[PDB]
């Protein structure tokens, strides 16, 4: 219905929201022909809309840079990072960066190259303008042949906690600079400023959960078939929903416990505040598979999905358009 009518309607109504402007096409576009580096691979706009991320991946170095953006002026780089330190990468690798819902002091980058390994490293964002403390952690965790699922939205749904599923645990490392989150009641290296100092001051909680121990305890202390099906072969764990209000996480666990082989499911609610608390919430039966469990879990989470405000959301970028500011860069 045109944009001028919308402005006229806003002037009197007093209600001006981005949603009402969705119908109109983008306001600013960019050719991305002259404003480009030279082998850069752009990853997308920032949540604030003030930078643009990119990486090179020239062993591999895998540098990443910020890019201050202007509608007509050329992009101006601000920062340069390694993001993979002391790691001789002999594989192609797949990068995907994502920012936290509320916290905007750092971003988490992921690397995806018989057993697999994943490179995850946080990088502090440039100061808006202390202004001195900027860090970047590194760490690698190897996964078993049945590689676990990967889902940023719930992994980073916590304000400063990122949940890493290592196929043997659900370690959730929380980093802050400045008093406890993990037990308020995976090896990580230190970097930043081209130095590796001993860890204002930074913090690392790294609270762990034992999947095998939790499953053993649950089956021992629950389940109808406590007189049979001792021990299991393998299992997969997926996070259903994370509740930052009370610091609780939901995990769906599937097993293949056994001359009788059958597939079974399970669920548990782990409370962050009080550590390792496997409060069971479901018990299934063994019937005469992993893809089926994944499909069931995704359907279950979709059924109960509640929309979240645009203010908080885990933006994921990988390889451009800024919906909030109606910006668009065409490649």
């Amino acid at each position: 219905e045109h944009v001028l009518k919308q402005l006229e309607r806003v002037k009197i109504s007093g209600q001006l929201s981005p949603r009402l402007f969705r119908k109109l096409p983008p306001r600013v576009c960019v050719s991305l022909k002259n404003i480009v580096d030279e082998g850069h691979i752009f990853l997308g706009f920032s949540k604030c809309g003030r930078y643009v991320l990119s990486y090179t991946s020239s062993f591999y170095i895998y540098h990443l840079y910020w890019w201050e953006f202007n509608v007509h002026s050329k992009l101006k780089l601000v920062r340069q990072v390694r993001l993979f330190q002391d790691e001789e990468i002999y594989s192609d690798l797949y990068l995907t960066v994502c920012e936290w819902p509320s916290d905007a002091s750092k971003v988490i980058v992921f690397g995806f190259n018989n057993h697999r390994d994943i490179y995850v490293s946080t990088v502090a964002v440039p100061p808006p303008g202390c202004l001195r403390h900027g860090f970047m952690l590194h760490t690698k965790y190897q996964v078993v042949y049945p590689f676990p699922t990967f889902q940023p939205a719930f992994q980073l749904k916590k304000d400063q906690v990122v949940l890493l599923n290592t196929s043997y645990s659900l370690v959730a490392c929380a980093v802050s600079v400045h008093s406890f989150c993990q037990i308020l009641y995976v090896v990580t290296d230190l970097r930043g400023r081209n130095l590796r100092p001993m860890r204002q001051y930074l913090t690392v909680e790294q609270l762990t959960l034992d999947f095998e121990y939790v499953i053993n305890e649950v089956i021992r202390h629950d389940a109808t078939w406590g007189h049979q099906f001792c021990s299991f072969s393998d299992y997969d764990i997926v996070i259903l929903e994370v509740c930052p209000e009370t610091n609780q996480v939901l995990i769906n666990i599937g097993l293949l416990l056994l001359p009788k082989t059958y597939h079974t499911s399970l669920k548990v609610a782990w409370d962050l505040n009080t550590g390792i608390f496997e409060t069971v919430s479901v018990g299934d039966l063994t019937e005469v598979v992993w893809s089926s469990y994944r499909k069931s879990c995704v359907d279950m989470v979709m059924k109960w999905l509640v929309p979240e405000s645009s203010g908080r959301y885990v933006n994921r970028m990988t390889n451009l358009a800024d919906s909030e500011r109606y910006t668009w860069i065409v490649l």
Binding site: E1, H2, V3, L4, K5, L7, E8, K11, I12, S13, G14, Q15, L16, S17, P18, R19, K23, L24, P25, R27, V28, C48, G49, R50, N70, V71, H72, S73, S102, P128, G129, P244, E245, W304, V306, P307, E308, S309, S310, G311, R312, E324, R325, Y326
Partner: protein, 786 residues
Amino acid sequence: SYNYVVTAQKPTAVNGCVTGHFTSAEDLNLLIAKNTRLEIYVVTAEGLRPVKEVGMYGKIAVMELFRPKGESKDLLFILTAKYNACILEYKQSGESIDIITRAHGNVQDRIGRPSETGIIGIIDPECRMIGLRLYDGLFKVIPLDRDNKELKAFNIRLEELHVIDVKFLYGCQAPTICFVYQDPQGRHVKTYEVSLREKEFNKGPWKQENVEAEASMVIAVPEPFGGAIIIGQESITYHNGDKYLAIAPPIIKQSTIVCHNRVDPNGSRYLLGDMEGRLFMLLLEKEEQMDGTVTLKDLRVELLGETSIAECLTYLDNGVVFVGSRLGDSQLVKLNVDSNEQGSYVVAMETFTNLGPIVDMCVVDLERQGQGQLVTCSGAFKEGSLRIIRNGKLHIRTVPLYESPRKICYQEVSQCFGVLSSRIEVTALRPSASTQALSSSVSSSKLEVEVHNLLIIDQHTFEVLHAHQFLQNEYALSLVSCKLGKDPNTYFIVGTAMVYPEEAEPKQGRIVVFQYSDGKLQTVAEKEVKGAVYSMVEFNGKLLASINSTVRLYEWTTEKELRTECNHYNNIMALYLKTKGDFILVGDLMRSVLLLAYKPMEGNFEEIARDFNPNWMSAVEILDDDNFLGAENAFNLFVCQKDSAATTDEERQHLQEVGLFHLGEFVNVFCHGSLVMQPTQGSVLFGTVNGMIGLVTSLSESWYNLLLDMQNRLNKVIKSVGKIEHSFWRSFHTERKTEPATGFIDGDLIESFLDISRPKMQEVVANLEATADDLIKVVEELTRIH
């Protein structure tokens, strides 16, 4: 920078509308929320009489009156825009007025998307619970059991995810809700039986039925009819069990229905208000069933007459109905059994002045003596008027225009108020100030439907001298009156744009310079510009006309034509322009604010600094050469000052927000001036959509610290109805983040001092010594500014 926000004129746009026996069980009361200004009235023989006006620390979003079992008089549930649900009661002991809070507590979820249609609040007819719709997919339910000390609100997932209107049905064993939601197929009606013991919904009765495409509201008919009525554009349907009745009369088709009310207690008569200020009476015809009950045989609607554009209706005793207007003056129209000769059943009795949306304004001093009065542009469609707000209590001269006023700029040489306005044509619906004028002209450029026209108004008597009409399909965007270049005369520069249904964005525009000679306005020159001229402002004698996403400087040549000089394309939508000296302030629609500079040596724009925060600006003002005030869509004020102390190129081009304040109203325009006769250094006037007019004044560091300490001490000694902390109320709040207000002293709270009891005044300064006289003197000095 340090500033001081005070309210010159309280808001006068009606937002909330309720009626019920509140003050006592034996007197009718009429309550109006307006914007954070709740007013209590009582119906008397002489008419509505004021009782009290409590100022809640929040924007009233829901008002409901309910009387739980065992209560002599009704309670009052109020939910602010910041989610501060709280039930209130009015207990008076003799001549002492007291309003205790039954219950209070924030009900913000923090994990939900605000609904498109806004906050909806309802209460069960039996008062079993209170239903709140705040976010998509979640329906907060508050139990009302008054036995325990805690009211545990709990959310219930809503599968619809697109609900529009929710209401509690009547005469059901369990509390049910009937609502209309939207799906890709279309809109639908659905019912849920709410359960508090199970904290979940249940399959409701009279299963969902498809509804019209434009269904917009639901009315819950009481017993003995029961059921619900869904009102939609050119469609009214009543759903109840197997019975289903629908009627689509032609009269309704003209406009949509925006408000409703119940006349008869049994729901046999309803009042419907339209966007064109039409009053419809909705009838339900009943028949004697075989069992001996009522079945609502048929439906029918009638046209009572025309009234001011209504945001609410509330029927009062003896046939008089109060019309709560948001885009115009409210009314106390009364229905008449006998029709008028013209065919109107409704005759007005009283009119309450409403400043309405203050689209634009500009202070003038036509009376000399260094005394200024505010001239604004109120009203939206047919209540459009110019309010001459002088200073006595303020005396306001309303000049009706019967058409929407857009802009205003007073020219002193010809002593006339050049004003933009737009009417609606199909041709002319009603006689408007544009239609009748001493002289009229129509654009002769060779370069329903709304007709735009820059018509001039006299300064003395306000008769419209001339009404110039613009090209067909052309919109009048911005207007300015100033002198250009070397010419001795003054022109009426107006920026216009061209609109076509085919395109969704402007692509052609116009910049025309007018001259009002004698009693006629002529076009000396014009310029065609690709785009729409959102805003214009004189800059050092050059017309700094802003086009879509660009800013330009025009030099008025000797050939009396506009020649562009320099441009600055780094913009998303340049909608606001304020200039001081050689500085320019471009307020982007979605890019916060930017500061520019014009270099005479190079004659080109050179961006100097910019605010990188994401904000949706509504108006921008440059308080000084350093402090730039701004107001955003979230009803908050923020001031960002250019920083030169830091010796860094990046820091030099960085604007840091050093002030934050949640004003609580949508600011439309800023203008420099004051209403008093010619401690604080400067004053700025701002107008809101709710009609509130306020002043922003700078303070020295010492005075700001003193007033901040005084306000902090005052908070302890002043009680807030609803138990809402002032710090939380004024704390800058928006979807992205919310931080405590800084650098802004709430003048309204400060003015409360010198009005509190003497022991309270002493307790405020008990150990500050300042005694009490000094505080009173400084407060009176601060008050004297406005």
